[PDB]
Design a protein around this ligand. Structure first.
Ligand SMILES: Nc1nc2c(ncn2[C@@H]2O[C@H](COP(=O)(O)OP(=O)(O)NP(=O)(O)O)[C@@H](O)[C@H]2O)c(=O)[nH]1
Length: 358
């Protein structure tokens, strides 16, 4: 049985600049607020810090993070750099094509380099995602669509008008019927007022497409345990409630080893939540997210295939409604879209046809 995650990864790449929304791809979309710790969740899954830091404003455009598992024997000759020590982990950006990044600091820098631009349109937020593959023996096969974080207070309770278009961007992504919403919220807050959960209920009223991740369990007030948060007595969400403890900024600056932060999280869970510890934590989260995505993709695969074909026939017949002038150039901008879309759909069906196992 062919692994389906790599297939959807390639489809994501195929529909990058051309418009992937109408495809309604099966994917996990990460919704979090400011100070929720969703960037840390991603880094917990990667096993490295790689996301741009901080201080402040930052991270406007979506990031499609594609974690690809490799064998520990599968390594890369690094850079040029006058060395040749074989590298165990590397990264690739779709914008830079086949270039290899063996230094995660150059990975973090390229993200900064691909973000924060004006981008030559008049906005503060761009809908165009960054595509980053991470090859590592320390990661599970998993892809996440990281969206720009919201303010932790309602949009009207803060002075920036731009927050609206941030909400629009998130809504645009999570309105995808085949998207799974990963809602990130800190245990440190009134969790039934999370902006992440609230905006998720706007497209998923009952939370049947939503999985809640509870971060910052180590930061709660004296003599609270969110056992209720562990229960999902309180949060109306169906795909699960998973509590984690990521590394703090203190830990990163101190260069806390990830092997040490992992067992520290585990030990914290064992102590504070003994009857629940086995269904919480970073490692657990990585495993159920992997299984969830695999099961979700195979569920959506048959409809995805026909939709690509249905879309193809529509765009082609639409090209015969536009349909001119037969000129080599200056044909149309709308005609150019449909042709570019048809080309991408062609690549999509090709990728899908290249699956075979029963
Ligand atoms: N103690 C502790 N600190 C955490 C945890 N998760 C995140 N943090 C810290 O609290 C902050 C959370 O923000 P971050 O992780 O960047 O995610 P974010 O809020 O989506 N991103 P940002 O606010 O930077 O735009 C970070 O400075 C991080 O170090 C956690 O589980 N425990």
């Amino acid at each position: 049985m062919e692994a389906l995650i790599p297939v959807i990864n390639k489809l994501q790449d195929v529909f990058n600049t051309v418009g992937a929304d109408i495809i309604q791809l099966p994917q996990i979309v990460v919704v979090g607020t400011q100070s929720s710790g969703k960037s840390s969740v991603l880094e917990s899954l990667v096993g490295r810090d790689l996301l741009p830091r901080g201080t402040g404003i930052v991270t406007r455009r979506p990031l499609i993070l594609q974690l690809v598992h490799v064998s520990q024997e599968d390594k890369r000759k690094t850079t040029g750099e006058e060395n040749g020590v074989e590298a165990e982990e590397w990264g690739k950006f779709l914008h830079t094509k086949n270039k290899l990044y063996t230094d995660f600091d150059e990975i973090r820098q390229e993200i900064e380099n691909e973000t924060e631009r004006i981008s030559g349109n008049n906005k503060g937020v761009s809908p165009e995602p960054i595509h980053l593959k991470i090859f590592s023996p320390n990661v599970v096969n998993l892809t996440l669509v990281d969206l720009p974080g919201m303010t932790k207070v309602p949009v009207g309770d803060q002075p920036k008008d731009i927050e609206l278009q941030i909400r629009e961007l998130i809504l645009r992504f999570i309105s995808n019927p085949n998207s799974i919403i990963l809602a990130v919220t800190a245990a440190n807050t009134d969790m039934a007022t999370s902006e992440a959960l609230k905006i998720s209920r706007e497209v998923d009223p009952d939370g049947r497409r939503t999985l809640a991740v509870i971060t910052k369990l180590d930061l709660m007030d004296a003599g609270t345990d969110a056992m209720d948060v562990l229960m999902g007595r309180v949060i109306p969400v169906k795909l699960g409630i998973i509590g984690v403890v990521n590394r703090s900024q203190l830990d990163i600056n101190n260069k806390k080893s990830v092997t040490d932060s992992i067992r520290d999280e585990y030990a914290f869970l064992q102590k504070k939540y003994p009857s629940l510890a086995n269904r919480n934590g970073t490692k657990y989260l990585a495993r159920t997210l992997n299984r969830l995505l695999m099961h979700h993709i195979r569920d959506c695969l048959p409809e995805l295939k026909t939709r690509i074909n249905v879309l193809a026939a529509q765009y082609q017949s639409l090209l015969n409604s536009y349909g001119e002038p037969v000129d080599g150039s200056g044909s149309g901008s709308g005609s150019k879209e449909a042709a570019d879309m048809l080309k991408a759909l062609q690549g999509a069906s090709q990728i899908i046809a290249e699956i075979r196992e029963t």
